Amino acid sequence: SHPVLEKLKAAHSYNPKEFEWNLKSGRVFIIKSYSEDDIHRSIKYSIWCSTEHGNKRLDSAFRCMSSKGPVYLLFSVNGSGHFCGVAEMKSPVDYNKWKGKFDVQWIFVKDVPNNQLRHIRLENNDNKPVTNSRDTQEVPLEKAKQVLKIISSYKHTTSIFDDFAHYEKRQEEEEVVRKERQSRNK
């Protein structure tokens, strides 16, 4: 058992059974991640960073939703075929590998295959399936309720947490290599 993950699980009630998916207000966005390593980092440090344009959109949404409702992020790694979790945005974007940064609170951490969601289509993206969205695509609230119900209710068999020790190793090893590469250059 990894101690870092057990500390995270103790401090947060991931995959809560009593999640309010029938939202009264709020804004919901698709987040496309470049890699699993970013999802892993986001979960351990409760931060996210999008592109410059993505950060501008999400920052605006967060400030526009201040004291009116939550902003939810539906995460999927590019080319993965599944959604891997849901986080709430908890701060505006702070600028200046990740250029920007904003706080997030991870709520669901579980793999939901795209075939459970592809029947939900987005009228604001040429009626393409919600699983065929670009980064920071906004989800109309009524379709977002259906997505959140499905993700919340799905009996998942796996999550990124099953690979926790692997992703820790990857980060550690890369950090060593990076520091070494700097040393040879000074």
Residue 183 in marked binding region: no
Residue 11 lies in a domain: no
Residue 69 lies in a domain: yes
Q: How far apart are the first and last CA of the chain?
A: 39
Residue 147 lies in a domain: yes
Contacts of range 137-143, beta carbons closer than 8 Å, 24 or more positions apart: 137/29, 137/30, 138/27, 138/28, 138/29, 138/61, 139/28, 139/29, 139/30, 139/74, 141/23, 141/25, 141/26, 141/27, 141/28
Instruction: Say how far apart CA 50 and CA 24 lie, in whole Å.
Output: 26
Count the domains in the chain: 1
Amino acid of residue 180: E
Domain span holding position 136: 19-155
Residue 150 lies in a domain: yes
Q: Resolution of the coordinates in A?
A: 2.3
3-state secondary structure of 148: helix
Q: Is 38 left (phi over 0), alpha (psi -120 to 50) or beta?
A: alpha
Residue 184 lies in a domain: no
Residue 164 lies in a domain: no
Residue 94 in marked binding region: no
Q: How was this structure determined?
A: X-ray
Residue 93 lies in a domain: yes
Residue 49 in marked binding region: yes
Residue 27 lies in a domain: yes
Instruction: Say how far apart CA 151 and CA 136 lie, in whole Å.
Output: 18
Q: Where are the alpha helices (DSSP H) in 12-98?
A: 36-45, 52-64
Residue 84 in marked binding region: no
